[PDB]
């Protein structure tokens, strides 16, 4: 909604498909890997 | 050490086997699954 008016962007949405294929991180250049590897299984298991 | 002197306590020691057998946790009053589901599977890999 503006000042004087609305206006109408989204009706309502119910899903049927879903498609999670989430690349987790590229970076590399931190030396990162201890933390890295529970978060990219984050990134995959429990985000999805 | 204390003041005037120290006392030895512990040689060093070099380990040869492991158990980890770590409970991760004994609540259940929260409900607290869903953070539950990550911090007992860090529990056991990333710790073990």
């Known amino acids: 909604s503006l000042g004087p008016q609305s206006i109408h ?3 309502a ?3 049927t498909l879903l498609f999670p294929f989430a690349a987790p991180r590229v970076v590399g250049d ?3 890997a201890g933390s890295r590897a529970e ?3 984050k990134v ?3 985000a999805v």
């Open 9 to 11: 962007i989204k009706d």
């Open 30 to 32: 931190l030396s990162e």
């Open 13 to 15: 949405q119910t899903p």
């Open 39 to 41: 978060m990219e299984m």
């Open 44 to 46: 995959l298991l429990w």
